[PDB]
Short mmCIF file of C-alpha atoms and ligand atoms in Angstrom, two decimals:
data_model
loop_
_atom_site.label_atom_id
_atom_site.label_comp_id
_atom_site.label_asym_id
_atom_site.label_seq_id
_atom_site.Cartn_x
_atom_site.Cartn_y
_atom_site.Cartn_z
CA UNK A 1 5.14 -0.73 2.48
CA UNK A 2 4.51 0.12 -1.15
CA UNK A 3 3.01 3.25 -1.18
CA UNK A 4 3.10 4.85 2.41
CA UNK A 5 0.17 7.12 3.10
CA UNK A 6 -1.69 5.33 5.58
CA UNK A 7 -4.71 3.76 5.97
CA UNK A 8 -8.22 5.51 5.85
CA UNK A 9 -9.28 9.41 5.53
CA UNK A 10 -7.87 10.12 9.60
CA UNK A 11 -4.61 8.67 9.11
CA UNK A 12 -3.85 9.84 5.36
CA UNK A 13 -5.28 13.15 6.30
CA UNK A 14 -2.78 13.11 9.19
CA UNK A 15 0.59 12.39 7.86
CA UNK A 16 -0.24 8.77 7.21
CA UNK A 17 0.07 8.86 11.19
CA UNK A 18 -1.42 6.24 13.74
CA UNK A 19 0.47 4.64 16.01
CA UNK A 20 -1.17 6.42 19.33
CA UNK A 21 -4.12 7.98 17.58
CA UNK A 22 -7.78 6.38 16.93
CA UNK A 23 -8.14 6.77 13.03
CA UNK A 24 -10.98 4.58 12.82
CA UNK A 25 -11.46 0.63 11.64
CA UNK A 26 -8.61 1.30 9.22
CA UNK A 27 -6.67 0.86 12.61
CA UNK A 28 -6.52 -2.98 11.46
CA UNK A 29 -4.12 -1.88 8.93
CA UNK A 30 -2.05 0.06 11.15
CA UNK A 31 -2.18 -0.37 14.81
CA UNK A 32 -4.52 -2.63 15.98
CA UNK A 33 -4.46 -1.75 19.22
CA UNK A 34 -5.89 1.65 18.46
CA UNK A 35 -9.31 0.31 18.02
CA UNK A 36 -11.04 0.39 21.37
CA UNK A 37 -10.12 3.90 21.36
CA UNK A 38 -13.35 3.89 19.67
CA UNK A 39 -16.50 4.21 21.23
CA UNK A 40 -18.74 1.25 22.24
CA UNK A 41 -21.31 0.21 19.63
CA UNK A 42 -20.62 -1.38 15.89
CA UNK A 43 -19.13 0.77 13.36
CA UNK A 44 -19.54 0.20 9.87
CA UNK A 45 -17.35 1.34 7.41
CA UNK A 46 -17.79 2.10 3.79
CA UNK A 47 -15.61 4.05 1.28
CA UNK A 48 -12.90 4.39 -1.61
CA UNK A 49 -9.34 4.74 -1.96
CA UNK A 50 -7.93 6.41 -5.48
CA UNK A 51 -4.19 6.74 -6.83
CA UNK A 52 -3.78 9.06 -9.29
CA UNK A 53 -0.08 8.79 -10.56
CA UNK A 54 1.32 10.67 -13.40
CA UNK A 55 4.81 9.88 -14.57
CA UNK A 56 7.32 11.69 -17.02
CA UNK A 57 10.43 10.35 -18.55
CA UNK A 58 12.63 11.78 -20.81
CA UNK A 59 9.70 12.01 -23.93
CA UNK A 60 7.66 9.06 -22.86
CA UNK A 61 4.97 9.54 -20.19
CA UNK A 62 2.55 7.05 -18.71
CA UNK A 63 0.65 8.89 -16.09
CA UNK A 64 -2.91 10.01 -17.10
CA UNK A 65 -2.20 9.50 -20.82
CA UNK A 66 -6.09 8.89 -22.22
CA UNK A 67 -8.13 6.22 -20.85
CA UNK A 68 -6.84 2.73 -19.71
CA UNK A 69 -4.59 3.61 -17.23
CA UNK A 70 -6.65 5.75 -15.26
CA UNK A 71 -7.09 5.39 -11.64
CA UNK A 72 -7.63 2.72 -9.52
CA UNK A 73 -10.87 2.87 -7.20
CA UNK A 74 -10.32 0.42 -4.86
CA UNK A 75 -13.33 -0.23 -2.29
CA UNK A 76 -12.94 -0.47 1.52
CA UNK A 77 -15.44 -1.60 3.77
CA UNK A 78 -14.65 -2.66 7.72
CA UNK A 79 -16.86 -3.80 10.77
CA UNK A 80 -15.78 -3.06 14.34
CA UNK A 81 -17.69 -4.34 17.12
CA UNK A 82 -16.60 -2.54 20.56
CA UNK A 83 -17.81 -3.40 24.04
CA UNK A 84 -16.10 -3.14 27.65
CA UNK A 85 -12.34 -4.28 27.28
CA UNK A 86 -12.89 -5.54 23.99
CA UNK A 87 -12.79 -4.31 20.20
CA UNK A 88 -13.32 -7.37 17.10
CA UNK A 89 -13.29 -6.16 13.59
CA UNK A 90 -13.28 -7.59 10.07
CA UNK A 91 -12.14 -5.48 6.75
CA UNK A 92 -11.44 -5.56 3.25
CA UNK A 93 -8.47 -2.56 2.42
CA UNK A 94 -7.21 -2.81 -1.28
CA UNK A 95 -3.55 -1.00 -0.82
CA UNK A 96 -0.96 -1.23 -3.85
CA UNK A 97 -1.84 0.82 -6.36
CA UNK A 98 1.57 1.95 -8.54
CA UNK A 99 0.35 1.06 -12.25
CA UNK A 100 1.89 2.37 -15.45
CA UNK A 101 0.55 2.77 -18.75
CA UNK A 102 3.11 4.51 -21.29
CA UNK A 103 2.08 4.40 -24.99
CA UNK A 104 3.83 2.23 -27.69
CA UNK A 105 5.01 4.81 -29.86
CA UNK A 106 7.53 5.90 -27.41
CA UNK A 107 10.98 4.93 -26.46
CA UNK A 108 10.99 1.82 -24.15
CA UNK A 109 9.66 0.78 -27.16
CA UNK A 110 13.27 1.91 -29.10
CA UNK A 111 15.05 -1.07 -28.11
CA UNK A 112 19.11 -1.62 -27.28
CA UNK A 113 19.56 -1.38 -31.29
CA UNK A 114 16.51 0.60 -32.73
CA UNK A 115 13.63 -1.66 -33.41
CA UNK A 116 10.30 -1.15 -31.93
CA UNK A 117 6.53 -1.61 -30.46
CA UNK A 118 5.10 -5.33 -29.04
CA UNK A 119 2.02 -5.03 -26.95
CA UNK A 120 4.30 -2.39 -24.71
CA UNK A 121 5.11 -0.87 -21.80
CA UNK A 122 2.48 -0.96 -18.59
CA UNK A 123 2.63 -2.50 -15.18
CA UNK A 124 0.21 -2.89 -12.17
CA UNK A 125 0.30 -3.95 -8.86
CA UNK A 126 -2.86 -4.62 -6.62
CA UNK A 127 -2.77 -6.26 -3.13
CA UNK A 128 -6.11 -7.05 -1.51
CA UNK A 129 -5.72 -7.62 2.33
CA UNK A 130 -8.33 -8.52 4.64
CA UNK A 131 -7.37 -8.69 7.89
CA UNK A 132 -9.62 -10.03 11.10
CA UNK A 133 -8.61 -8.23 14.62
CA UNK A 134 -9.36 -8.12 18.10
CA UNK A 135 -7.99 -5.15 20.49
CA UNK A 136 -7.78 -5.60 24.27
CA UNK A 137 -7.88 -3.36 27.48
CA UNK A 138 -5.28 -5.34 29.44
CA UNK A 139 -5.07 -1.98 31.77
CA UNK A 140 -6.92 1.25 32.39
CA UNK A 141 -3.72 2.59 30.62
CA UNK A 142 -2.62 -0.57 28.33
CA UNK A 143 -3.91 -1.79 25.32
CA UNK A 144 -3.10 -4.69 23.69
CA UNK A 145 -4.37 -5.71 19.60
CA UNK A 146 -3.50 -7.83 17.09
CA UNK A 147 -4.60 -8.51 13.62
CA UNK A 148 -4.08 -11.53 11.04
CA UNK A 149 -5.29 -10.84 7.25
CA UNK A 150 -5.60 -12.99 4.26
CA UNK A 151 -3.51 -11.20 1.26
CA UNK A 152 -4.29 -11.15 -2.51
CA UNK A 153 -1.53 -9.90 -4.49
CA UNK A 154 -2.10 -9.11 -8.10
CA UNK A 155 0.68 -7.86 -10.51
CA UNK A 156 1.20 -7.69 -14.20
CA UNK A 157 3.65 -5.52 -16.44
CA UNK A 158 4.74 -5.79 -19.98
CA UNK A 159 8.00 -4.90 -20.22
CA UNK A 160 11.34 -5.54 -22.67
CA UNK A 161 14.87 -6.38 -21.59
CA UNK A 162 17.41 -5.94 -23.45
CA UNK A 163 20.35 -5.84 -21.21
CA UNK A 164 22.10 -6.80 -24.42
CA UNK A 165 22.28 -10.51 -24.26
CA UNK A 166 24.51 -12.46 -21.47
CA UNK A 167 21.68 -13.08 -19.65
CA UNK A 168 23.16 -12.23 -16.17
CA UNK A 169 25.96 -9.89 -17.74
CA UNK A 170 27.42 -13.51 -18.91
CA UNK A 171 28.08 -16.60 -17.30
CA UNK A 172 27.06 -15.19 -13.81
CA UNK A 173 24.60 -18.12 -12.99
CA UNK A 174 21.23 -16.47 -13.08
CA UNK A 175 19.15 -16.97 -16.40
CA UNK A 176 19.31 -20.12 -18.30
CA UNK A 177 16.28 -22.49 -18.79
CA UNK A 178 15.51 -25.66 -20.98
CA UNK A 179 14.06 -23.22 -23.42
CA UNK A 180 16.76 -20.91 -23.41
CA UNK A 181 17.25 -22.00 -27.06
CA UNK A 182 15.06 -19.32 -29.10
CA UNK A 183 17.47 -16.94 -27.20
CA UNK A 184 20.57 -16.63 -28.72
CA UNK A 185 19.12 -18.34 -31.64
CA UNK A 186 15.52 -16.80 -32.87
CA UNK A 187 17.54 -13.82 -34.96
CA UNK A 188 16.40 -10.38 -33.63
CA UNK A 189 18.77 -9.23 -31.27
CA UNK A 190 16.99 -7.13 -28.81
CA UNK A 191 13.82 -7.03 -27.21
CA UNK A 192 12.82 -9.70 -24.78
CA UNK A 193 8.78 -8.88 -23.89
CA UNK A 194 6.89 -10.42 -21.44
CA UNK A 195 3.16 -10.19 -20.59
CA UNK A 196 1.78 -11.25 -17.32
CA UNK A 197 -1.94 -11.72 -18.34
CA UNK A 198 -2.14 -11.85 -14.63
CA UNK A 199 -0.36 -13.34 -11.87
CA UNK A 200 -2.08 -13.81 -8.33
CA UNK A 201 -1.16 -15.21 -5.18
CA UNK A 202 -3.08 -15.95 -1.69
CA UNK A 203 -0.82 -15.43 0.91
CA UNK A 204 -1.20 -14.40 4.98
CA UNK A 205 0.15 -11.38 6.90
CA UNK A 206 -0.66 -10.07 10.11
CA UNK A 207 0.33 -7.07 13.05
CA UNK A 208 0.20 -6.47 16.72
CA UNK A 209 0.70 -3.38 18.78
CA UNK A 210 -0.12 -1.49 21.95
CA UNK A 211 -0.76 1.83 23.17
CA UNK A 212 -0.13 3.14 26.76
CA UNK A 213 -2.08 6.04 28.43
CA UNK A 214 1.31 8.09 29.43
CA UNK A 215 -1.42 10.54 30.74
CA UNK A 216 -4.97 11.64 29.94
CA UNK A 217 -3.58 13.87 27.37
CA UNK A 218 -0.72 11.92 26.01
CA UNK A 219 -0.68 8.78 24.18
CA UNK A 220 1.93 6.76 23.05
CA UNK A 221 2.30 3.25 20.85
CA UNK A 222 3.94 1.02 19.01
CA UNK A 223 3.25 -1.61 16.06
CA UNK A 224 5.04 -4.39 14.14
CA UNK A 225 4.02 -5.85 10.90
CA UNK A 226 5.28 -9.16 10.64
CA UNK A 227 6.94 -9.82 6.75
CA UNK A 228 4.29 -10.98 4.53
CA UNK A 229 4.00 -14.44 3.15
CA UNK A 230 2.42 -14.03 -0.37
CA UNK A 231 3.62 -17.41 -1.39
CA UNK A 232 3.97 -18.15 -5.42
CA UNK A 233 2.30 -15.54 -7.85
CA UNK A 234 1.40 -18.05 -10.85
CA UNK A 235 -0.19 -16.70 -13.88
CA UNK A 236 -0.57 -17.65 -17.90
CA UNK A 237 1.94 -15.08 -19.78
CA UNK A 238 2.84 -14.67 -22.82
CA UNK A 239 6.79 -13.90 -23.60
CA UNK A 240 8.17 -12.42 -26.99
CA UNK A 241 11.39 -11.34 -28.14
CA UNK A 242 12.94 -9.45 -31.14
CA UNK A 243 12.41 -8.65 -36.49
CA UNK A 244 10.01 -9.90 -33.40
CA UNK A 245 9.25 -12.91 -31.82
CA UNK A 246 6.15 -14.47 -30.17
CA UNK A 247 5.78 -17.04 -27.51
CA UNK A 248 2.99 -18.37 -24.99
CA UNK A 249 2.80 -20.24 -21.27
CA UNK A 250 1.82 -19.61 -18.10
CA UNK A 251 4.76 -18.12 -15.59
CA UNK A 252 5.38 -18.65 -11.56
CA UNK A 253 7.11 -15.87 -9.60
CA UNK A 254 8.53 -17.05 -6.18
CA UNK A 255 10.26 -15.06 -3.12
CA UNK A 256 8.23 -11.68 -4.07
CA UNK A 257 8.11 -10.54 -0.56
CA UNK A 258 6.80 -7.95 1.91
CA UNK A 259 9.18 -6.29 4.35
CA UNK A 260 8.68 -6.39 8.32
CA UNK A 261 7.41 -2.99 9.50
CA UNK A 262 8.30 -0.90 13.12
CA UNK A 263 6.22 1.96 13.80
CA UNK A 264 5.82 3.55 17.09
CA UNK A 265 4.57 7.27 17.37
CA UNK A 266 2.90 9.92 20.09
CA UNK A 267 -0.28 11.70 20.56
CA UNK A 268 -1.10 14.68 22.71
CA UNK A 269 -4.83 16.89 23.12
CA UNK A 270 -3.62 20.44 23.49
CA UNK A 271 -6.93 21.21 24.10
CA UNK A 272 -10.91 20.13 23.00
CA UNK A 273 -10.39 21.49 19.29
CA UNK A 274 -6.55 20.48 18.41
CA UNK A 275 -4.58 17.23 18.95
CA UNK A 276 -1.14 16.28 17.23
CA UNK A 277 0.19 12.94 16.16
CA UNK A 278 3.94 11.88 15.10
CA UNK A 279 5.53 8.49 14.21
CA UNK A 280 8.66 7.00 13.14
CA UNK A 281 8.43 4.39 11.09
CA UNK A 282 11.02 1.70 9.80
CA UNK A 283 10.70 -0.78 6.25
CA UNK A 284 12.98 -3.46 6.89
CA UNK A 285 13.46 -4.13 2.79
CA UNK A 286 17.07 -5.38 4.05
CA UNK A 287 15.47 -8.44 4.84
CA UNK A 288 14.26 -9.11 1.41
CA UNK A 289 17.70 -10.99 0.77
CA UNK A 290 16.43 -14.03 -1.45
CA UNK A 291 16.34 -14.64 -4.98
CA UNK A 292 13.33 -13.46 -6.96
CA UNK A 293 13.23 -15.76 -9.93
CA UNK A 294 10.47 -15.91 -12.96
CA UNK A 295 10.08 -19.23 -14.23
CA UNK A 296 8.31 -19.97 -17.87
CA UNK A 297 6.43 -23.13 -18.51
CA UNK A 298 4.54 -23.24 -21.73
CA UNK A 299 2.21 -25.93 -23.05
CA UNK A 300 2.03 -29.71 -21.82
CA UNK A 301 5.64 -29.47 -22.97
CA UNK A 302 8.70 -28.47 -20.26
CA UNK A 303 10.19 -25.90 -22.36
CA UNK A 304 11.94 -23.70 -19.79
CA UNK A 305 13.27 -20.07 -19.43
CA UNK A 306 14.32 -19.59 -15.54
CA UNK A 307 15.60 -16.05 -14.46
CA UNK A 308 16.78 -14.76 -10.74
CA UNK A 309 16.74 -11.49 -9.80
CA UNK A 310 18.98 -10.27 -7.01
CA UNK A 311 17.35 -8.29 -4.22
CA UNK A 312 20.09 -6.12 -1.57
CA UNK A 313 17.87 -3.22 -0.42
CA UNK A 314 17.87 -0.89 2.25
CA UNK A 315 15.70 -0.13 5.15
CA UNK A 316 13.34 3.01 4.40
CA UNK A 317 12.72 5.07 7.08
CA UNK A 318 9.27 7.72 6.89
CA UNK A 319 8.42 10.48 9.65
CA UNK A 320 4.83 11.63 9.91
CA UNK A 321 3.01 14.40 11.39
CA UNK A 322 -0.56 15.77 11.48
CA UNK A 323 -2.91 17.90 13.49
CA UNK A 324 -6.69 17.02 13.94
CA UNK A 325 -8.62 20.24 14.31
CA UNK A 326 -12.29 19.81 16.04
CA UNK A 327 -13.59 23.29 14.54
CA UNK A 328 -16.75 22.69 15.35
CA UNK A 329 -19.62 20.05 16.59
CA UNK A 330 -19.87 18.51 13.02
CA UNK A 331 -16.52 19.83 11.10
CA UNK A 332 -13.26 18.13 11.58
CA UNK A 333 -10.17 19.68 9.55
CA UNK A 334 -7.05 17.68 9.34
CA UNK A 335 -3.72 18.16 7.87
CA UNK A 336 -0.05 16.66 8.02
CA UNK A 337 3.24 16.02 6.48
CA UNK A 338 4.81 12.81 5.58
CA UNK A 339 8.60 12.39 4.89
CA UNK A 340 10.40 9.16 3.51
CA UNK A 341 13.88 8.29 2.56
CA UNK A 342 17.36 6.51 3.16
CA UNK A 343 9.38 10.86 -0.33
CA UNK A 344 7.42 13.80 0.53
CA UNK A 345 3.54 14.94 0.28
CA UNK A 346 1.18 17.24 2.04
CA UNK A 347 -1.71 15.84 3.37
CA UNK A 348 -5.34 17.32 4.30
CA UNK A 349 -8.67 15.86 4.84
CA UNK A 350 -12.29 17.09 6.21
CA UNK A 351 -15.17 15.17 7.56
CA UNK A 352 -18.53 16.26 8.48
CA UNK A 353 -20.67 14.81 11.14
CA UNK A 354 -24.08 14.40 9.51
CA UNK A 355 -25.08 14.26 12.87
CA UNK A 356 -23.74 11.72 15.57
CA UNK A 357 -23.42 8.42 14.55
CA UNK A 358 -23.23 9.30 10.71
CA UNK A 359 -19.99 10.83 9.46
CA UNK A 360 -18.12 11.67 6.06
CA UNK A 361 -14.33 11.88 5.42
CA UNK A 362 -12.54 13.04 2.79
CA UNK A 363 -8.66 12.53 2.41
CA UNK A 364 -6.04 13.99 0.14
CA UNK A 365 -2.29 13.39 0.09
CA UNK A 366 -0.17 14.88 -2.42
CA UNK A 367 3.40 14.10 -3.18
CA UNK A 368 6.18 16.89 -4.13
CA UNK A 369 8.06 16.55 -7.42
CA UNK A 370 10.98 14.32 -7.89
CA UNK A 371 13.01 14.14 -10.58
CA UNK A 372 14.61 12.32 -16.58
CA UNK A 373 11.95 10.34 -14.40
CA UNK A 374 9.52 12.95 -12.93
CA UNK A 375 6.27 12.05 -11.20
CA UNK A 376 3.34 13.77 -9.55
CA UNK A 377 1.14 11.78 -7.11
CA UNK A 378 -2.62 12.44 -5.49
CA UNK A 379 -3.72 9.85 -2.98
CA UNK A 380 -7.30 10.73 -2.21
CA UNK A 381 -9.97 8.84 0.02
CA UNK A 382 -13.37 8.89 0.72
CA UNK A 383 -15.31 6.92 3.74
CA UNK A 384 -18.56 6.82 5.10
CA UNK A 385 -19.25 5.55 8.76
CA UNK A 386 -21.91 4.73 10.94
CA UNK A 387 -21.98 3.35 14.76
CA UNK A 388 -24.71 1.91 16.44
CA UNK A 389 -25.25 1.40 20.27
C1 C8E B 1 12.15 -1.41 -2.82
C2 C8E B 1 11.27 -1.43 -3.62
C3 C8E B 1 10.79 -2.22 -4.67
C4 C8E B 1 9.46 -2.57 -5.13
C5 C8E B 1 8.90 -2.73 -5.88
C6 C8E B 1 8.92 -4.40 -6.53
C7 C8E B 1 8.52 -4.65 -7.93
C8 C8E B 1 9.37 -5.54 -8.59
O1 C8E B 1 9.12 -6.05 -9.52
C9 C8E B 1 7.98 -7.12 -9.33
C10 C8E B 1 7.89 -7.84 -10.81
O2 C8E B 1 9.01 -8.62 -11.48
C11 C8E B 1 10.21 -8.40 -12.48
C12 C8E B 1 10.72 -9.21 -13.42
O3 C8E B 1 11.56 -9.20 -14.41
C13 C8E B 1 10.93 -8.87 -15.25
C14 C8E B 1 10.26 -10.21 -16.32
O4 C8E B 1 10.59 -11.22 -16.24
C15 C8E B 1 11.56 -11.47 -16.82
C16 C8E B 1 11.27 -12.92 -17.79
O5 C8E B 1 11.32 -14.38 -17.83
#
């Protein structure tokens, strides 16, 4: 729900699509019902995801500065056992990769008046999901599936919060803690620099969906992703306002929610070479209407500083389309397009069968340019899969 390129080489290479198509073990993260579309035997998957973001804000620019905001390379492994009407599997998929690392010599450093620096502007969100799923042919044409995952969410930024003063415009009611004394006092005027470093949390998520063989050549499906339940993000941070003001203590974040998700899609085989998929996805960010407050405790002491962040978003809809072309017995080509709004990326991938039971797959998603703030984005994925039977 944070990026949205789909999981695995097949899905990424086919527009993030996957509701009614067999996209491999990654199905555990999309539509669990899709497993069991796979062939009997045991399947092992091994690969890694890479997010390459480049951002230019004017002239500041995190993206790929030098060598420390480089790309996160998250590993992914998966197991799937197929037998008769059954499918069982577990995996470790590392979604999330929206990190930034601007310098220290630019603005966003320059504060609401003219002062500078600090440890400066960065930000990183990492999310691990360990799904345990099952898929069952309830019929020769109906297959349901589901998966419950353990989730590891880990973020941490480095940013300034001026908003002048006021603390919520003024007497709003949000900001205000029994340590908000240094605030107002001190004697700087502009430069709240928090430095999470580091605030994870173990949560629980899950999903279930179905596929229905309308015809031997057309399949449909739908999947529903429950609202993730991440719990509190705890971590030792070091706040510091602005001369300059240093501080230290561990912070707690409550209500960092991940929206529920609904997905319906279609797949059709036009012959033994070409197949096409199309999915519709809705991300209910409208249901994340709660308060997200950032707490600040410090030593053995009870110095406080709460800040509530209003959360009012709107549902996001994304449409996807992809094709899988079986060029021949060992080369498969995939391409697709992914559109999100209410935001656009070309998709491609190639699979090479190193003989049956063994296949290397490489997929990549390229975002189109949006614009100030302009960013480029590339999502590469490479996986190795071997089945035993
Ligand atoms: C609709 C898409 C939203 C996706 C973005 C979710 C990421 C939001 O921010 C998470 C970090 O929390 C921000 C906190 O405020 C800044 C620091 O805290 C203040 C000091 O007490």
